[PDB]
C-alpha cells in the first residue's frame, strides 16, 4: 500500500477477499495468525489513507454474510456495492448483440424463444450462449448459428440439474 | 605369447575404469575454493547492475555482481546464481521450475491403446472438438469471437469409464499430459499448495501441447456452510488461487481444464461456471453398442474356445460398467485354473454375470 | 465389390430417358448410401456415386437433376468430400451451353447449402460461380448487388488459409465499387492483406495489379498524395525484376505528381536519382 | 616384445596412483563422509549441471559431479551432502518422508490353516486371488485376467479377519506391513492420504507384502451425505487407492487387504477386477 501514496493515477484490487470469513483459532500462531495480523495492519495502513484520497481499494467477495462486521464502520469499508442477477429483458438483450456483433448471424435466428421464457438469469447463462450454440456449429462444422441451435442448447445451458429433473415443487 | 594378448586388451579396457572414475572427483577437490551457490531469482531493479534479490533459502540477502554477464538475462523472473560468502551473482543460470514428481509426473501419456473404456462415440469425440481445435487452426473462434473453451467436466462413478480416459485419450493426441495428484499438493507443514500448481504452468507457456488432468477430487468439493472447519479452512483459502488460473491474466486455450467427483453435493457453484466447466460427461449404462468396443478388447485378452455368443450377455448386463466387464473373465476364468485349461464356455462366463449382479452397491 | 454389377444398369441410361432413371436407378443410389452412413468415412469408393450423377446430367433436363441433388444434401451424401465432385463435375456440361440455362444455374446456385452458411466445402470454386454470376448482372444492369455477393463470401472458404484465390475476388470486388462511384467503399475492403506480400517473394503482376486499381479510388477524390505513394512499390519493381520499357513512361507521371504536393519526408529523398537523368528530356526539366 | 619389461613395472606401480587414488582422497573426505552432515534432496535430473534442495530448506546449485551416476538422478531423490561446500556424499534410500506410519513385522505367525476353520470355503476363493499370482503368472497373462490385490471381509473376530489375514502371511512367506485404519486419517491436510502412494512405494520396491487395513470403520464412515467434507483426506485416501492399482501394478510385492467388524457403506465403485473382489460376511 506505499506505491497508493506515492503515484496517485493507481488502484489496488484485491480478488475474492472470502478466502476468510468469520474466524479461527486452533494452533494460534501456526496456519492461522497470518491473516490476523492483517486485521490489524488493516486498521494501520488504512489510518494513512484519506491523506491523499487517490488510494483505490476493491475487494471481492462470494458470501458477505459471514464476513467482518466490524470492516463496515466508516473509515475502512463505507458502502458496499450489491450484485444480484436480476436480469430483466431489457439487460439481457444489450449482452445479446454484443458479442454476436463480430459473429455474422443468419437473419432467421432470433432468441425471443429463449428471451421471453428464461427469467432471473445471470450474464453466465448469456455468455455460454456464444459458447454451447457456437459449439454446436463446430460439431456440425456450421458456419452461422440457426435458431434451432438455440434452442437445442437451450436444455443444458440453463438447467444444470443432471440429477431428477427440475422444480418438484408443482410438478 | 598370444594367452596374454587377449587378457592385455581387457586390461587396458580395465585400467579406463580404473581411472576415469576418481577424475571427476579430482575436479570436487579443487572446488573447495568455490562453495554451492544458493537460490535466487530477480525481483526488481534498484541500481544500475546490482538489483533486489530474495533467496529462497532464508531471509532477503541482496547480493553484488559480477561482470561475466550483462543485464540482458538479470530481468526479472530468472534463476541466479548467488555466493553465501562473497555473495554476489556468479553466472545465470536457466530459469528452473524444479520438475519435482508432483510438478511434473514422471508418467506421461500412456503406453495403452484406445479406450478400453470407451465405445460411446458422441460423448468422447464431443471432446476432442474442443482440444484439437487450437491445436492445428484456432481460425473457427476468430471469425464466431470467443474465447476457447476449456470447459470438461466429469460425475459419477470413480475409476470405471472416468479416471482413466486421461491416460487413454490425452495420450493419443500427442501433448504433455502432467498427472496433478490432489494427495501430492496437500504440504501438511506449511502448505504451498496452489503456488505449486502456479510454477506447473510455465510449461504451457514454454510447451503448448500441455494436458493437465486434476483426478478425482471431492475434497474442495464441500464448502462448509457452517465454516467451522479446522484445517479445511485453508482449503477453500488455496482454491481461491486455482480459480484465478481461469479469471486472471492467463490466458491460453491449450491447457485444458478437467476437475472429477463423486456426487453433485455442495461442491462450489464458481468453478461450475458455464465457461470454467463445459463439457459434462455423464456415466450411464448404455446398450449393447456402448459396450460393444469394450467387449472386443475384453475378447481378444481371454484365449478360449472360437465358439460364443455375447449378444445375449448384453440384456443380462444391469448395474454393470466397463469395470464390471472386466470381472466377468476374470471370475469366470477362476473356475478355469483347476480344470487344467484355459477355455471358458459361453454359458460359464454368463455364471460371473449374473454373479456381479448380486454383489451389486 | 458391389460395383461390378451396376455397369449392368449403365444399359438403360442409353436407350432409356433418364427420368425413368431418377426413381427406378434412384434406388440403387439408396441402397449404397446405407451401406456406411456416419459410421466410417470410406468404406470403398465414393467416385462412382458422383459418376453416375454425372451421366444424369446431359441426359434429361436440368430441371429434374437439381431437385435430385437438393434431397442427397439434406441428409448424408456419403463422404463430405463426395459432395464436391457430384456438384462441380456436374457444372462442367454447363460451361459448353449457358444460353438459356443461365437462369437455370442460378437456381443451382440457391439450391446448395454452402451459399448461405459455409458447411464443408472450403475451395473458392462456388464463389467463382457467383463471379461469374456477377460478369453476367454486369451485362444486366446489376450493380449494387454485386459488391454485396462477394463480400463476406470470401472469408466463408478460406479466412487465414489460401490469400492466392482470395486475391482475385478482393480485386473483382473493388473493381464494383469503381463502376458504382463509391471510392470509399473499395478503400475498407481491402485491409487484412496489407503489406504481407511484400513480406513473401515477388510474384510481379500481383502488385501490379493493386495499385492500378487504388489510384482510381483516389481518382474520384482528386488525392495526389496517395498516389504517389502506390507508385513507390512498382517504382523499384520495374528497375529490378522488369525492364525500362514500361518502367520510364510511369516515372513521368511519378515525377509529375511529386510537384502537385508541398514535398514530404519522403519526397525529399525523392529529389536526387540516378536513372532520371538520361533519355527524355522533359523527366530532366521535371527533375 | 622389450616394451612390457618396463610397461608391466609401470603399471604395476601406478596401483597406489589410480585405483588407491580414490581412497587417497577421501581423508578429508570421510570425515565429511561421516553420517554428523547435513542431508539434501534432489530436485532435478549451459552445459551440464543440477539442482538440489537440503531439507533445511536450502537450496543450492552445483555443477556438473561425477560423484553420482547418470541413472542415479531422479527427482525427489533422498540424498546427502556437506555442511558447507554442499557436495554429495551419501545417498539416502528411496522412500521419501516416513514408511507406513505404523507397523507390526511377523515373518511367520502360528496361525495357520489348521488353526482357522470354516473359512475353507472363502480360502478355496482366497488362493485364485493372492497366492496363486504371487508365483505362477503363465495361466493368467495368456487369459488376460489381472488378479486383485486383496478382498474385504467384517464379521467378529477369532473367526477370521485379525487372525485370517496373519495366516495368510505365513503360507505365502511374504512381508507382514500393518498399519490401522484410524491410523491413516491425521490431524493436518493429507498426512496420512501422502503415505498412501508413500506405502506402496515401498511395498513395492522391497520384498513382497500383503498390506493389511484394521478396523476399516474408522476411514470408512461417509456414506452419501454432506458431512465428508469435514475429513477431506478421508475420501482422497479412498481414491487414490482405487485409482493408483493399474499404475502400481505388473508385480508381486504390492497387495492391498482391508478388514473390518462390519461394513455398513455400500460403494458399487469397489467392484473391479484389480480392485476388492470378495466380500466375506
Not at chain 4, 60 to 72: Q, R, S
Request: glycine share 4%; charged share 30%; proline share 4%.
Amino acid at each position: 500500500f506505499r506505491l497508493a501514496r506515492e503515484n496517485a493515477p493507481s488502484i489496488i484490487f484485491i480478488d475474492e477477499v472470502d478466502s476468510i470469513a468469520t474466524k479461527r483459532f486452533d494452533a494460534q500462531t501456526g496456519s492461522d495468525r497470518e491473516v490476523q495480523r492483517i486485521l490489524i495492519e488493516l486498521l494501520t495502513q488504512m489510518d494513512g489513507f484519506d491523506q491523499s484520497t487517490n488510494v483505490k481499494v476493491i475487494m471481492a467477495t462470494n458470501r458477505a454474510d459471514t464476513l467482518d462486521p466490524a470492516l463496515l464502520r466508516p473509515g475502512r469499508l463505507d458502502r458496499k456495492i450489491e450484485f444480484p442477477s436480476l436480469r430483466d429483458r431489457r439487460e439481457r438483450r444489450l449482452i445479446f448483440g454484443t458479442i454476436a456483433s463480430k459473429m455474422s448471424l443468419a437473419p432467421e435466428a432470433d432468441l425471443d424463444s429463449l428471451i421471453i421464457r428464461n427469467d432471473s438469469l445471470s450474464g453466465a447463462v448469456i455468455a455460454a450462449i456464444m459458447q454451447e450454440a457456437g459449439l454446436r456449429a463446430v460439431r456440425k462444422n456450421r458456419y452461422v448459428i440457426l435458431q434451432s441451435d438455440l434452442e437445442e442448447a437451450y436444455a443444458t445451458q440453463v438447467k444444470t440439474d443432471n440429477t431428477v429433473d427440475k422444480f418438484d415443487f408443482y410438478k | 605369447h598370444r594367452r596374454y594378448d587377449d587378457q592385455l586388451k581387457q586390461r587396458r579396457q580395465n585400467i579406463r575404469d580404473l581411472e576415469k572414475l576418481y577424475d571427476k572427483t579430482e575436479n570436487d577437490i579443487k572446488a573447495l575454493q568455490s562453495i554451492g551457490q544458493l537460490i535466487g531469482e530477480v525481483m526488481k531493479e534498484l541500481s544500475e547492475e546490482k538489483y533486489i534479490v530474495k533467496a529462497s533459502s532464508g531471509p532477503r540477502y541482496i547480493v553484488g555482481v559480477r561482470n561475466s554477464v550483462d543485464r540482458s538475462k538479470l530481468k526479472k523472473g530468472v534463476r541466479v546464481t548467488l555466493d553465501i560468502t562473497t555473495l554476489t551473482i556468479m553466472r545465470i543460470l536457466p530459469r528452473e521450475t524444479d520438475p519435482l514428481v508432483y510438478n511434473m509426473t514422471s508418467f506421461e501419456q500412456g503406453e495403452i491403446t484406445f479406450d478400453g473404456i470407451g465405445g460411446l462415440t458422441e460423448q468422447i469425440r464431443e471432446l476432442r472438438e474442443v482440444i484439437e481445435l487450437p491445436l492445428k487452426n484456432p481460425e473457427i473462434f476468430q471469425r464466431v469471437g470467443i474465447k476457447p473453451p476449456k470447459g470438461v467436466l466429469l460425475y459419477g462413478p470413480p475409476g470405471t469409464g472416468k479416471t482413466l480416459l486421461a491416460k487413454a485419450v490425452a495420450a493419443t493426441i500427442g501433448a504433455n499430459f502432467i498427472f496433478s495428484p490432489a494427495s501430492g499438493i496437500v504440504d501438511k507443514y506449511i502448505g504451498e499448495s496452489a503456488r505449486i500448481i502456479r510454477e506447473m504452468f510455465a510449461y504451457a507457456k514454454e510447451h503448448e501441447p500441455c494436458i493437465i488432468f486434476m483426478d478425482e477430487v471431492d475434497a474442495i468439493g464441500g464448502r462448509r456452510f457452517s465454516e467451522g472447519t479446522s484445517a479445511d479452512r485453508e482449503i477453500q483459502r488455496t482454491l481461491m488461487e486455482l480459480l484465478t488460473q481461469m479469471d486472471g491474466f492467463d490466458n491460453l486455450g491449450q491447457t485444458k481444464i478437467i476437475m472429477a467427483t463423486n456426487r453433485p453435493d455442495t461442491l462450489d457453484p464458481a468453478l461450475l461456471r458455464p465457461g470454467r466447466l463445459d463439457r459434462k460427461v455423464e456415466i450411464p449404462l448404455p446398450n449393447e453398442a456402448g459396450r460393444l468396443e469394450i467387449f472386443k478388447i475384453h475378447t481378444a485378452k481371454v484365449k478360449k474356445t472360437g465358439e460364443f455368443d455375447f449378444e445375449a450377455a448384453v440384456k443380462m448386463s444391469d448395474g454393470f460398467n466397463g469395470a464390471d466387464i472386466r470381472n466377468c473373465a476374470t471370475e469366470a476364468g477362476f473356475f478355469a485354473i483347476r480344470d487344467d485349461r484355459d477355455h471358458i464356455n459361453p454359458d460359464d462366463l454368463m455364471k460371473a454375470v449374473r454373479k456381479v449382479a448380486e454383489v451389486k452397491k | 465389390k458391389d460395383y461390378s454389377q451396376i455397369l449392368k444398369e449403365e444399359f438403360p441410361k442409353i436407350d432409356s430417358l433418364a427420368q425413368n432413371d431418377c426413381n427406378s436407378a434412384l434406388d440403387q443410389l439408396l441402397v449404397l448410401e446405407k451401406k456406411t452412413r456416419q459410421a466410417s468415412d470410406l468404406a470403398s469408393s465414393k467416385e462412382v456415386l458422383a459418376k453416375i450423377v454425372d451421366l444424369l446430367a446431359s441426359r434429361n433436363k436440368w430441371d429434374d437433376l437439381n431437385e435430385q441433388l437438393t434431397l442427397l444434401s439434406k441428409k448424408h451424401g456419403q463422404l463430405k468430400l463426395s459432395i464436391q465432385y457430384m456438384i462441380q463435375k456436374v457444372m462442367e456440361y454447363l460451361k459448353s451451353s449457358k444460353s438459356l440455362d443461365l437462369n437455370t444455374r442460378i437456381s443451382v446456385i440457391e439450391t446448395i447449402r454452402v451459399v448461405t452458411e459455409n458447411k464443408i466445402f472450403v475451395e473458392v470454386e462456388r464463389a467463382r460461380v457467383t463471379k461469374d454470376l456477377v460478369e453476367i448482372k454486369k451485362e444486366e444492369g446489376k450493380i449494387d448487388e454485386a459488391a454485396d455477393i462477394l463480400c463476406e463470401l470470401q472469408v466463408e472458404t478460406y479466412g487465414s488459409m489460401e490469400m492466392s484465390e482470395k486475391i482475385q475476388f478482393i480485386l473483382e470486388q473493388m473493381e464494383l465499387s469503381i463502376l458504382k462511384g463509391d471510392y470509399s467503399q473499395a478503400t475498407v475492403l481491402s485491409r487484412k492483406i496489407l503489406k504481407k506480400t511484400f513480406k513473401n517473394p515477388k510474384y510481379e503482376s500481383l502488385k501490379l495489379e493493386y495499385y492500378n486499381l487504388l489510384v482510381k479510388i483516389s481518382l474520384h477524390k482528386r488525392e495526389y498524395l496517395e498516389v504517389a505513394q502506390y507508385l513507390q512499390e512498382i517504382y523499384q519493381t520495374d528497375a529490378i525484376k522488369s525492364d525500362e520499357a514500361k518502367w520510364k513512361p510511369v516515372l513521368s507521371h511519378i515525377v509529375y505528381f511529386l510537384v502537385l504536393s508541398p514535398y514530404g519526408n519522403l519526397q525529399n529523398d525523392l529529389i536526387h536519382k540516378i536513372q532520371n537523368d538520361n533519355n527524355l528530356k522533359k523527366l530532366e526539366s521535371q527533375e | 616384445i622389450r616394451i612390457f619389461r618396463s610397461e608391466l613395472q609401470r603399471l604395476s606401480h601406478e596401483n597406489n596412483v589410480m585405483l588407491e587414488k580414490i581412497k587417497d582422497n577421501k581423508e578429508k573426505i570421510k570425515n565429511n563422509r561421516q553420517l554428523p552432515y547435513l542431508v539434501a534432496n534432489v530436485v532435478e535430473v549451459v552445459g551440464k549441471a543440477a539442482v538440489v534442495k537440503t531439507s533445511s530448506r536450502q537450496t543450492v546449485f552445483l555443477p556438473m559431479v561425477g560423484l553420482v551416476d547418470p541413472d542415479k538422478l531422479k527427482p525427489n531423490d533422498l540424498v546427502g551432502v556437506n555442511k558447507d561446500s554442499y557436495l554429495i556424499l551419501d545417498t539416502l534410500p528411496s522412500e521419501f518422508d516416513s514408511r507406513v506410519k505404523a507397523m507390526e513385522v511377523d515373518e511367520k505367525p502360528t496361525e495357520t490353516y489348521s488353526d482357522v476353520g470354516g473359512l475353507d470355503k472363502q480360502i478355496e476363493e482366497l488362493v485364485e486371488a493372492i497366492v496363486l499370482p504371487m508365483k505362477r503368472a503363465d495361466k493368467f497373462k495368456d487369459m488376460g485376467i489381472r488378479a486383485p490385490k486383496g478382498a474385504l471381509m467384517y464379521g467378529p473376530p477369532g473367526t477370521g479377519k485379525t487372525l485370517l489375514a496373519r495366516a495368510c502371511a505365513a503360507q505365502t512367506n511374504a512381508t507382514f506391513l500393518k498399519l490401522a485404519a484410524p491410523q491413516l486419517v491425521q490431524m493436518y491436510i493429507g498426512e496420512g492420504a501422502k503415505l498412501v502412494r508413500d506405502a506402496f512405494a515401498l511395498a513395492k520396491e522391497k520384498a513382497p507384502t500383503i498390506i493389511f487395513i484394521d478396523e476399516l470403520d474408522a476411514i470408512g464412515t461417509k456414506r452419501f451425505d454432506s458431512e465428508k467434507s469435514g475429513d477431506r483426506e478421508v475420501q482422497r485416501t479412498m481414491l487414490e487407492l482405487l485409482n493408483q492399482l493399474d499404475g502400481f501394478s505388473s508385480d508381486d510385492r504390492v497387495k492391498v487387504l482391508a478388514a473390518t467388524n462390519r461394513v455398513d457403506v455400500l460403494d458399487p465403485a469397489l467392484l473391479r477386477s484389480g480392485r476388492l473382489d470378495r466380500k466375506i460376511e
